[PDB]
Each structure stands twice: as C-alpha cells, then as structure tokens.
Design a binder for these strands. Structure first.
Ligand SMILES: [Mg+2]
Ligand SMILES: [Mg+2]
Ligand SMILES: [Mg+2]
Ligand SMILES: [Mg+2]
Ligand SMILES: [Mg+2]
Ligand SMILES: [Mg+2]
Ligand SMILES: [Mg+2]
Ligand SMILES: [Mg+2]
Ligand SMILES: [Zn+2]
Lengths: 145, 82, 21, 50, 40, 73, 70, 42, 97, 87, 592, 58
RNA sequence: UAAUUAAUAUAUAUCAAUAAUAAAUUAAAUUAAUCUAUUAGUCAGAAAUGGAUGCCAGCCGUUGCGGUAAUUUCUAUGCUUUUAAAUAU
C-alpha cells in the first residue's frame, strides 16, 4: 500500500500489525488499503520534493550544495513514480544549476538511460510513445485493426 | 484520446447550489434557539506555511472548477462582445 | 458506484430491498 | 539617524496592505446541516453542522 | 505585551453571519466627487 | 478598485479569520419553514431565521464575493 | 453638541484619596489588546505635576487621581 | 418610593470603579500591610 | 412580543386592540425597532414595521464595538454598553447587537 | 426571597416530625375547598415545638413521623411548611 | 414541591419498547440490484451529485477529472480506446466551428459599404453611425453564438454530440493539462464564470439549464414561477449576459495595462527605476498605483518568458509589510492587520513638523541614495522583520538565531566513601535520580536565564545519579523541566500551530460524543482523506514556529457559564451542545 | 486584577519571607521557633511589608 | 543498625476527603482486581391524546388553574428534553 507500506496479499487494512501505526487510533475504526495511481504517485513526488529542499535548508544535517547522491536519488524517485513532466523539468534545471557548471554534480550514464527509459514508457501529450499497446478492437472507431 | 461511445442517460441537475428545498410543516426540534446557541471548535486556516503531501487546496479547487466549467460549457456562449 | 448515472430519480425500483420470492 | 535628523519612516506611514494576487474561489464545503433530506439532520443524529 | 490575541476574539453565534471590513467603511470607498470635481 | 469594486465580506464563526465566508444553504432545518412562508406569501414580510440563509427573496443571493459597490449593470 | 461626553471627579470627598498604580493607569490604556487613548485621566504626581495617565505610564510613575474626561 | 433604596440615574463608569479600588483590602494583602500573627494556611 | 390592550371608544363600546414590539435588522450595520397599538394582529405587525423603518439607526463598523463605555438610560432602564473581547449579552440583546 | 418563613427549619433544609392532629382549613378566596393541615411536633435543645404544616403527602398504612420540607406559597395563608414523605 | 409525594419515580415505558424493533428487519434475500454489491448497505436512488469525490476516501476518483468517469468500473474503462482527439465527435465539432477559421465565409461588403467603412475608420466626424463594427467583433460574435447554437443529444438525429461524448472529450482534456495550461484555465474561469457565480439567482435556473439542454425535475412549476417573476422587470434587466456591463473608474482600463508602461526601460536597469518614476503616470492614489505597478512587473515578466521577482510586492509595500509583521507580533494572530485593530491615539495638528523639516532639508549625494528600496530600515530589528521570510537572506545575515552551542553534559567527581565496598552498592540502584536545587536565590522564573547561565557562579545546580551510580550535570531539557512550562510561539513570519482546532481537539471536548478517528472520510471535520506523515519531517524547520494555547476554547469551556434562556427549561449555557440520547439503547451485532 | 491574585498561597502574590530578616536581623526567627507557647494560637508576629511602605524609615 | 523488598489499613469513626472518573457501538502495549447503576416534565415556556373529576378531589417557582368539553387536577398511553436529577435550605 502507498500509504502504510503493508503487503497487498496478506493484509486487509492500513497499519495492521504495525506497532507504531498512525492510521489506527484507540477507539477509531479500521481503514482499508488505498491503491496506487496518479494521486499517491504525485504524493510520493511531493514528499521527495520537500526532502530535496530540506537537504540544503537544514543547518544541522544539511549540505552546503547538493551532492550527486541527492540528485540521482531524486531523479530515481521521479522515474519510479512514472512522473514524466517533473523528470524532464528537473533534468533541465539540473544542467542549469551552479553545481553542474562547477562540475560538482554530473549526469551519469545510469541517470541518462533511466531518464530515457521513462521518457519512452509513459504517455506523451501530442504523440504516440514507445510502450503504447495497440488495441485490436479500436477498429470500431479508427477503422483499422 | 481514450474514446468510447458511451450513453450516459441521467445527469443530475445543475450545480447552481440554489434549488427550492423540500418543505415540511412540523419539524423535529421545535427549538430555534439552538441555531443561535450552537458553537464549534476554531477553524484555523493555516499552520506553518500550510504544507501537505496530498495537495488539498489546489487539487480540490481544480476538481470543483472542472465540473463547474463542464456545466456552464466553458461559459463560452454567454458573453458577447461589449 | 456507476449505477447512479442510469437511474430515474423518482423511481426507487424496490424500496424494501427484499426480493422475497 | 543617530543625530535625530533622518526622515522617519514609521508604522504610522503604512496604509492598507492590499490583496494583490486573489487567492482562489472558495467552494462551498458540504456541512452536516446541508442535506437534501430533512432526515440526517434529525435530532437523534445531528447535534449541529459540525 | 498584550496576551489578548486578536486571533481568538469574537463569539460564534451559530448560523448568524455578519459583515466585516477589510480596511475602511464602504461608503468611504469611492471618492469620485472630489476626483472628478463634482462639488459646488 | 479599477473594476466592479471590493467584495462583500461576511463570516459565520468566531472571527473573520476563524469562520467560513459561506452562510448556510436552504437545506438547513430551521430555514425550511421560513423559506416556505416566503415562497407562499411573497409580498408580506416574514419572521424567521431564514434571513441568515444564503438564499433569499431578492434576486441578489448572498454568496461570497458579491461585488456590492458595483455600478452594475 | 459638546466636545465633552462626560467629565467626572475621581473623589467625592477630600477625606478620600485615591491612588493610581502605574499598572492600573496602564490598564485604562488597553481596550482588549488595542491601544486606546480616547478617555483622559488626570493625576497629581509625587512631584506636584498635573499629568494625563499616558505621560504617567510613559515614565511609570504612580499618581493621585483627579478626574476623567472624554 | 419614599421608603426605599436610592437608585442611580445611570450606571457607573466601570473604569472609574476599578480606579477607586487601588487601596482596597486585596491590594493591601498583596502589599503585605497586615501583620501575620497566627499560623495561617498550613 | 404580542399583547392585548382594551381600547374604550365609548362607555358601551369596547374594542380589543393588540400591541406589537419588533425590531428590524440587517447584520450589515443597520437596524431599527418599532412598536404599535392597532386593531388586528396583522395590523400592529405592519404598523410596528413601518414604525421601525422610521427609526432606523446605523453604526460605524470601522471600530467593531464601542471604544468607551456608554452609560445611558432609556425610560427607567439603565443600560451599559462597554467594550469586550467578544459579544456578551442576554440572548435577545445579543442578537440585536 | 423571604427568609422568615423558614423559622422552624432553624437553618436546615429538611426536618423530622411526629404526627399529632390533622384538621382542615379553607384557603383564601377565590380558591375554595378544604386544605389538609397536619399539626406536628419536634424537639430541639430539649424544647418541644409544635410545627404547623401543609399535608400534600401520601398516607399508607398508619405511620407516625414525616419529613418537613420548605417553601413556595400556597392558597392557605400562614401555612409555610410542607410534607415530603411519611415514615 | 417534591415530585415524590403520592408516588415514586415513574418507570412507565422506561424501555419504550415500541422503539426497540420495527418488526421487519432483513434477510439473505436482499435484492442484488438495490443493495451494494456486497449487500452491505442500501444504494441511494436520488439524482447523482457531481462532487461526490470530496466526501469519500476512494482513490480511483482522483485519477479522473469529471465525476461519472470516476465512478466507472474498470471493465468499461478498458473498452475506451485511444484515437486521435478530433475523432472524438465533440473534438470534431470543435475543430470545425471554433478552430477552423478558413472555412468561415463572411458576408461580402459592397463597394459603397467598403468606402463608407474606410472613411469612417480613417477620420471620425461626429453624429455618424456608431456601429461601423470591426469584422473581428463580427467574427467573435459569430463564434460565441456558435457556442450558443451548439446542442447535445443523439447524433443520428439533429445534434452533433452525445452529452457523454462531450464530457468525455472534456475529461481526457482536463487530465491532459500542465501547469500553465490549468493556469490559463483557472484564469479563464475567474474572468468569465466566477463573477456570474456571484450574480446568479433562482430566476435564472431554467436558463442556466438551457446551456446543456438538460431537463429539470419541477420544470413546469419553474416555468410558471419564473414567468411570473421575470414579469416584474424589464427583459433587459433579468438576463445574465448583460449583468456585468459597467465598471468603476473608466479612465484606466485593465485592457490597456496589458502593455506595461516603459517596459523597454525598467527591464534593462530595474534599479534606476524605483516605483516613483512610474507612479507619476497614474492619477490614482498611492495604494492603488503601487498595486498596479506590481501587476505590470508580473505581466511583463510572464511576457518575456522569465520568472518575476516575488519579493517585489514586499519591496513596494515595505512599510505595510513591517506594519503587518509588527502587528502580528503585538496582537497574536496570523493574517493581515485590518482597520479595527489600529491604535486610537489622537495626534496634534502640527505633529508632523519635526519630520517635515527633516525631509525638507535632507540632501542626497546621488539619486539612488535618494530613493533606494531599503531606506525604511535603521536598526537591526528592522532588518530582521524585513527579512524573516527568506530563510536565505535571514540565515546568512543572522547566523546566531539558530543556536549551535550548548552547555556540555559533564560528569561530576564522586565523594569518597570511607566505609568502602560495604556501602559501595548503595548509591547504585534501579533508576535515575534527579536533584534540582531550590533556595531563596534560586527557582524564580523572573531570573531564569541568569540562573541557567554557565557564566554565573550562583547558578542553580542540578545533579543526576545514573542507575550505575555515577553522576552527571543535567541535560538542558532536564534543567528547563524545573521551571513552570513556557510557551514560545511567534506570529511574525509563519503561522504557529494553534490549539483547540478542528484537527487538534480530540473528540470529547470538540463534540460531546465519542467520534471514531478513522484516517479516512471524516464528515464532521470536512476532510476527504488523510495520509499521516510524521508531523515535522517533510516540512522546513523554520516553518515550525510554536503553539498558542493562551485563549479560552469557547466551544468547550467558558467563563461565567449561564443559561441563555431560562424558559423554556431546555436551553443551557452555550457550552452544552449535544444530540438527544434515545429511548433505551439498541445494540446491533457488528462484524457485518 | 482577578481572583487568582487573591490567593496568596502562590508565592508570587505574597511579600517574601526574607523581608522580616531585613527588619529584625538575619536568622532572627530560629530563636522564636523554639518558644514555649507557640502556634496556639499565636506565633511571634512576622513582619513582612514591602520595604517602600515601611512607616519607620520612609 | 529492631526494621526499611517499605507505602496494605479491617472494618472503624469523626466532623470531613469535591467519585454517574470514556453514563453508551470497534476493546483495554495490565497486574483483570471494585462495581451491574435509576428518577424529570408534559398551561405559560421543548412536549398531547383518551378516560375519569366537576369550586370537589387536587395542582401552586410564579400570574393563577378546577363552573360537565380542564392543553394547569388524578390515571393510562405516547411524546419532550443541551445527557453527573429532581426537590428543599
Ligand atoms: Mg433564616
Ligand atoms: Mg399561590
Ligand atoms: Mg525628530
Ligand atoms: Mg474578593
Ligand atoms: Mg409549547
Ligand atoms: Mg403537577
Ligand atoms: Mg363526567
Ligand atoms: Mg386533559
Ligand atoms: Zn495501506
């Protein structure tokens, strides 16, 4: 589950058998699992965002400039959320940064190719994309099988 | 994109929010004072920049805005050129 | 959840809910 | 300023703080006193709107 | 200080609405007679 | 200030900051008998709490951001 | 009409003498969190000066009550 | 009512009522005027 | 309030007149109050209403409440209107305010 | 509040009494009837007082002592005390 | 008097057993049509609301824009196939009528008309025909009425589009939106719809329904009602298109401030152009003209495809900024200080003289110094209030406001025990032992910081014996534990978290009943769903301010509690709100 | 000005103890505490009056 | 160095010492020990119908009610409450 991180098969509710769970309070009621989709996908996105700001903002635990590790971690999150627009913009922003021009952060092969992979496999607004599955029955409308 | 020819027979009425409500004569509590007497806990608009993972304000605004635009058919015939 | 779109607002086809027999 | 001759700008010279970028339409959020049936607002269920 | 906290003043009357002003009273808003020079 | 004027800003709650801008709609318990009386005998004036509703006799409804200083139409 | 709503002496007698603590005079100034100079209260000081309550509060001196006028 | 209590024409300014109270018993106890001659609260 | 006063038009003739007291208000800063003695109930109602519109008062709401105590007496009724953190008053007086 | 009608409660909210008599008395016009009055006794500091009270109670099988309670006013003038239960 | 002469407490219908059962309950026979798929609960057969997503914690809803498609079963959703956007018949219609210009034929002008039109357009002579309408107005009239004439329905009959087909196109389009896409959208919504949303009225509902050609429930009775009521005014009066016609202050039109003034200058050196140089342009008052300058800057920036300075509204309104920061500090609140909360001081007439001669006599080396943005500020307090918001500028300029240093936890040397091993067990025990000192010179809140100061040698002493028997100085938390609890909440930059709110107050105080806490769908609290991250984790730390508990929670408990109305006997003090308790309780078994 | 400031049982509302030392000498009461008849009802009178009110000196 | 592995004292008293401690739906991160827990109104002012009664019986915080049609008494039934009770001091 996107919310409580319990397995879908063996568990009916959010926070079952977790000692520290927020989602079950004393005389409260049980809450069924919530499902993945655009909602929680961009939830994960936003959380990662916040962390990314807090990485340079925090006096105690913060780094002065962004480390490479943080960059490829964020990009990996975007990839793993099937989050397209954000991945693109972030990449460009990155190569627009100070850390990039200093030489501190780089774009590696791994980042590059995962970026491209996700570019391929999710819907693009105006065009058809690698990883669009042809529907046999769309002939009902399109006219071609 | 993602089309199928669908027949949607019953759409509920217009969300103008103003519809003559159902009328009664007698009521359950005959005590109108309760209207004026009732209080609640405080609604605080904001805490600490108002951050949330579920983006509530934006998302809910847009969703309302959507069916409102739908029902007005994008307000596109109503305004002439002044 | 999808049923709400095809119903006729005044008609509550079986107010009791019981088919009986 | 130290010598008393610097023209004051105090909070007394500050007028209204204007709303520049208008927030959003606040849509009507359903309360327990808004229901199309007079039931659910009955005295055995609802003590007030929230 | 003052501990009286302008945030928390007021009494909830339940459903009863009331007006409030953002800045000045509304009559005082449009000043056009001195602007457009309509005065005796 | 250059168009349509300022908003009519009301509240229901403790303050302007603690409450909502919204009045309660017609579906309220206490508003129904009054609104009825108002629909039937429209020309005479009618007692009730149905005044405080977002619905009323006049063509101008009370809902938030009414521009009331507007020289409309 | 007048510029004076009401004007009242602090003491009915000379045999009664009312003393104003700096905090009291500071209370008068405050109307539920907003600073209010409307009403004027007038004092003798240990120093033989006749003052309003606002100057008094300024320098935190307590004084003897005379009258109140607004 | 010749035989009965005198009534004010209008109210008393509450502010002034608080101003006449400076030297009252409570403020005296807080100043420590009365001597503590007995055991007092335990 | 509604009430009944007898009205003597002659030593034989006696009519039943009623007596209304009401107050018109709009939370927008304008109220007024009226009373009347008329023959019917509807009559005293309409009467007192146009009487209450004759007497309409306004309040400047820039300040939202009185900034100094107002001590004033209506006939035999001594009234204090003073600044508070919120609205405190008897229920009726409260929603008149 | 009328503080002199309580004279025989002697600062107490309820009292105990022994039954002696019951006679009947006619209330102040325009209220007619027979109001039942019970004539009672109790003792305080070895003084025996005769307390005279309204009988509103329910009498079952024959019993002696009642519980006297306080006020309000009644049709019958001079009646000030009332009956709660009978023991 | 006593209720209990003549009889005891009446036990008559104490169960009120006529209320216990309805004599008809349920079965295994529950209709699969009219119940839930699960036979859990009855289906509601009244007309569909379009907002339902807001009240229920179901997550598929948020994957689609419009409501019916959210309620769609997956099995149908699969039979929707991806086709070009104009193959959607509504997209087709939109393509023909709105987007296709070249297919539009206009009535051809005669030569008489061509000449009259031309000569009207070049040189105006009064009294002439005031129409002379530009073909652009004609064109846009034609388009808007093409939106009037567009109607839905079955398309083997007259109309172009199925209603479902149109909201289909709409739905696929609303999901297709980017940032500035739905920005353009919301803008277009605020400029067209929103004002109408304020000017509506029952008298229009039929007309409001004539946009989609949907049929109402009461349609006859609304025909009659609205006929009788629109009878009471001019037809002009009552139609909605013309209700927005007029505007206050005609001399400056919003349309003409679209081109920003002298954008070819203050773009290139925005420093040499303080607000004054521009503000000489408008015949308005101060607050309005600075407002307008902000809007100019933003329009301009959006036009040149660069991002605008968001600190400009802080810089032009600087005096207002600080007035507000300091007000918020004084009266404790978050928001914008409004008029009722201004001080009631009355200045003399000549009050401004000192400043007036200070201004009249000021002199400036160059003009930048004359009006720079920051002359508002002198002491550090000012620099602290003017930048509290950027944690950037603030963190750099005020490094000591985040405490990085502290009194180190140190171990004390133990006193020698002569008794030796015999007692060496004794000071070693189960627990930790805190010892805080008190005395005439210690424990006064007034003096607190002097007392916790490492530099002061009369400093209040604590000691802690760890269960093994060593002793250490107190951690600063422990030190502070020994003073009366202290509230730090400051209101000047971000809103502190405040007590006794909707989501704060637990049930029994907020409502007088137990209300189940589920992390989904709290109707009472007007929330749809809740994910509950750890409170302060994902947020910035400067954003955490404090907590204000310092007021009466009026729903719960208040001072001078009293009955509102003595008669009828029913009403209590305004803190006693509660639902009626029923006749004796009925318990249904609830595994379900 | 309120009820809470009536309760002198707070130490914040009460003139402190040490004043009685400043008047009569320091550790002066330890004498008086061992006295034969004490606290029934009466104890050796304890003078605490804010030093700016002292009738003697001022 | 009687003892501190102690705070437990059973069923007595005096004048104290405020207990209906989530008074009603999801369950007790125990050690499961004490408890089985209810009242009011019903003209005015939240809430009424039958049946008696007929200046009687009775109600009474208060104006006052009861004169064969009592929404003010008694009884039956329902119905009303903003839910630590009515009532007396
Ligand atoms: Mg007595
Ligand atoms: Mg009587
Ligand atoms: Mg000067
Ligand atoms: Mg006192
Ligand atoms: Mg009634
Ligand atoms: Mg009775
Ligand atoms: Mg009979
Ligand atoms: Mg009867
Ligand atoms: Zn889950």
């Amino acid at each position: 589950c996107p919310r409580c991180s319990l397995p879908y098969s063996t568990t009916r509710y959010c926070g079952e058998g977790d000692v520290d769970t927020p989602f079950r309070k004393h005389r409260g009621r049980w809450a069924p699992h919530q499902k993945w989709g655009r909602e929680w996908y961009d939830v994960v996105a936003r959380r990662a965002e916040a962390l990314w700001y807090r990485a340079t903002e925090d006096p105690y635990f913060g780094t002065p400039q962004h480390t490479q590790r943080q960059a490829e971690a964020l990009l990996k999150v975007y990839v793993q959320a099937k989050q397209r627009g954000k991945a693109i913009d972030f990449m460009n922003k990155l190569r627009g940064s100070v850390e990039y021009l200093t030489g501190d952060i780089t774009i590696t092969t791994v980042m590059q190719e995962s970026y491209d992979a996700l570019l391929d496999t999710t819907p693009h607004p105006h065009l058809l994309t690698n990883g669009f599955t042809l529907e046999s029955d769309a002939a009902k409308y399109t006219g071609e099988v | 994109m993602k089309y199928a020819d669908l027949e949607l027979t019953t759409r509920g009425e217009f969300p103008h929010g103003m519809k003559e409500p159902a009328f009664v004569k007698k009521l359950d509590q005959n005590i109108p004072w309760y209207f004026s007497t009732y209080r609640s806990m405080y609604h605080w608009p904001i805490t600490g920049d108002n951050w949330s993972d579920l983006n509530e304000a934006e998302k809910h605004h847009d969703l309302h805005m959507f069916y409102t635009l739908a029902w007005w058919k994008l307000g596109e015939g109503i305004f002439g050129v002044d | 959840e999808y049923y709400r779109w095809f119903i006729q607002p005044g008609r509550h086809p079986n107010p009791s809910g019981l088919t009986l027999n | 300023y130290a010598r008393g001759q610097h023209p004051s700008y105090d909070m007394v010279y500050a007028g209204p703080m204007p709303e520049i970028f208008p927030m959003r339409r606040d849509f009507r959020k359903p309360t327990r006193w808004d229901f199309h049936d007079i039931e659910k607002q009955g005295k055995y269920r609802t003590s007030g709107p929230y | 200080k003052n501990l009286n906290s302008w945030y928390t003043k007021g009494t909830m009357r339940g459903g009863v609405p009331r007006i409030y002003y953002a800045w000045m009273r509304p009559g005082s808003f449009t000043r056009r007679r001195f602007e457009k020079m309509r005065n005796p | 200030e250059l168009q349509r004027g300022p908003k009519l800003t009301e509240f229901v709650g403790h303050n302007p900051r603690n409450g909502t801008p919204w009045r309660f709609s017609q579906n309220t318990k206490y508003f129904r008998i009054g609104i009825w009386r108002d629909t039937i005998r429209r020309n005479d004036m009618n007692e009730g709490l149905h005044a405080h509703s977002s619905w009323q006799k006049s063509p101008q409804q009370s809902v938030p951001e009414v521009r009331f200083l507007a020289p409309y139409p | 009409d007048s510029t004076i709503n009401v004007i009242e002496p602090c003491s009915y007698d000379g045999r009664t003498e009312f003393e104003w603590s700096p905090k009291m005079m500071r209370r008068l100034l405050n109307t539920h969190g907003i600073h209010n100079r409307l009403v004027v209260y007038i004092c003798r000081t240990a120093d033989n000066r006749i003052i309003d309550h606002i100057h008094a509060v300024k320098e935190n001196i307590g004084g003897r009550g005379l009258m109140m006028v607004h | 009512h010749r035989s009965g209590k005198a009534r004010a024409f209008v109210f008393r300014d509450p502010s002034l009522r608080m101003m006449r109270a400076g030297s009252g018993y409570q403020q005296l106890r807080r100043m420590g005027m009365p001597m503590q001659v007995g055991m007092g609260w335990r | 309030a509604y009430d009944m006063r007898v009205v003597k038009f002659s030593p034989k003739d006696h009519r039943q007149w009623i007596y209304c007291v009401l107050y018109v208000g709009s939370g927008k800063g304008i109220a007024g109050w009226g009373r009347a003695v008329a023959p019917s109930t509807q009559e005293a109602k309409k009467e007192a209403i146009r009487e209450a519109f004759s007497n309409i008062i306004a309040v400047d709401l820039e300040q939202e409440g009185p900034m100094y105590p107002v001590r004033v007496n209506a006939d035999g009724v001594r009234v204090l209107l003073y600044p508070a953190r919120r609205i405190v008053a008897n229920f009726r007086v409260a929603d008149i305010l | 509040l009328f503080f002199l009608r309580m004279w025989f409660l002697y600062g107490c909210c309820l009292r105990f009494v022994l039954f002696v008599l019951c006679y009947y008395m006619s209330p102040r016009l325009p209220s007619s009837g027979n109001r039942r009055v019970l004539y009672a006794v109790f003792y305080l500091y070895n003084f025996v007082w005769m307390l005279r009270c309204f009988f509103c109670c329910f009498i079952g099988l024959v019993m002696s002592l009642f519980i006297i309670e306080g006020g309000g006013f009644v049709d019958l003038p001079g009646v000030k005390y009332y009956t709660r239960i009978v023991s | 008097r006593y209720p209990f002469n003549k009889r005891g407490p009446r036990e008559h219908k104490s169960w009120k057993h006529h209320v216990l059962t309805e004599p008809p309950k349920p079965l295994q026979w529950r209709d699969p049509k009219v119940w839930t798929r699960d036979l859990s609960v009855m289906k509601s057969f009244d007309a569909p609301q379009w907002d339902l997503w807001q009240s229920r914690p179901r997550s598929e809803d948020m994957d689609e824009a419009l409501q019916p498609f959210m309620d769609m079963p997956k099995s149908l959703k699969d039979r929707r196939y991806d086709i070009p956007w104009w193959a959607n018949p509504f997209g087709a219609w939109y393509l023909q009528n709105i987007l296709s210009l070249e297919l539009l034929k206009l009535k051809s002008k005669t030569n008489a008309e061509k000449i009259a039109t031309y000569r009207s357009y070049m040189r105006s002579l009064a009294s002439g025909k005031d129409n002379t309408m530009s073909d652009d107005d004609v064109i846009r009239n034609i388009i808007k009425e093409r939106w009037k004439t567009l109607e839905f329905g079955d398309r083997n009959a007259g109309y172009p589009c199925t209603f479902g087909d149109y909201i289909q196109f709409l739905n696929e389009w609303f999901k297709s939106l980017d940032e500035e896409g739905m920005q353009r959208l919301r803008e277009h919504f605020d400029r067209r719809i929103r004002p109408l949303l304020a000017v509506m009225s029952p008298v229009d509902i039929l007309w409001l329904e004539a946009l989609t050609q949907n049929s109402p429930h009461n349609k006859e009775q609304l025909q009659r009602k609205i006929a009788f009521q629109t009878s009471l005014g001019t037809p002009e009066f009552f139609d909605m298109s013309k209700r927005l016609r007029y505007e206050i202050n005609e001399d400056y039109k919003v349309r003409d401030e679209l081109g920003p003034e002298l954008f070819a200058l203050w773009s290139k050196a925005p420093e040499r152009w303080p607000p004054e140089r521009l503000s000489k342009m408008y015949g308005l008052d101060f607050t309005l003209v600075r407002k307008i300058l902000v809007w100019h800057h933003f329009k301009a920036c959006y036009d040149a495809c660069v991002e605008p300075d968001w600190s400009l509204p802080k810089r032009l309104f600087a005096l207002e900024w600080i007035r507000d920061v300091r007000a918020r500090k004084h009266g404790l609140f978050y928001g914008k200080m409004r008029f009722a909360e201004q001080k009631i001081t009355f200045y003399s007439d000549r009050f401004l003289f000192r400043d007036l001669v200070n201004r009249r006599e000021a002199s400036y080396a160059n003009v930048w110094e004359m009006d720079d943005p920051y002359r508002f500020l002198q002491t550090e307090q000012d620099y602290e209030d003017y930048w509290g918001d950027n944690y950037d500028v603030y963190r750099r300029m005020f490094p000591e406001m985040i405490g990085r240093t502290g009194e180190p936890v140190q171990q004390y040397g133990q006193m020698p025990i002569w008794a030796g091993p015999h007692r060496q067990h004794a000071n070693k025990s189960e627990h930790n032992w805190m010892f805080a000192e008190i005395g005439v010179n210690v424990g006064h809140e007034a003096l607190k910081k002097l007392e916790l100061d490492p530099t002061n040698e009369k400093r209040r002493r604590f000691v802690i014996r760890q269960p093994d028997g060593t002793l250490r100085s107190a951690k600063m938390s422990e030190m502070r534990a020994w003073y009366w609890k202290e509230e730090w909440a400051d209101f000047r930059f971000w809103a502190p978290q405040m007590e006794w709110g909707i989501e704060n107050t637990p049930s029994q105080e907020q409502y007088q009943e137990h209300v189940p806490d589920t992390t989904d769908a709290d109707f009472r609290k007007q929330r749809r769903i809740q994910s509950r991250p750890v409170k302060w984790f994902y947020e910035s730390h400067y954003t955490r301010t404090g907590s204000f508990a310092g007021f009466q929670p009026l729903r719960f408990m208040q001072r001078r509690t009293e009955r509102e109305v003595r008669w009828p006997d029913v009403i209590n003090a305004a803190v006693q709100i509660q639902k009626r308790k029923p006749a004796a309780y009925i318990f249904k078994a609830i595994p379900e | 000005s309120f009820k809470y400031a009536t309760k002198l049982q707070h130490d914040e509302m009460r003139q402190p103890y040490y004043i009685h030392e400043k008047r009569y000498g320091i550790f002066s009461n330890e004498r008086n505490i061992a006295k034969a008849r004490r606290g029934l009802p009466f104890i050796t009178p304890l003078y605490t009056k804010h030093m700016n009110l002292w009738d003697t000196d001022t």
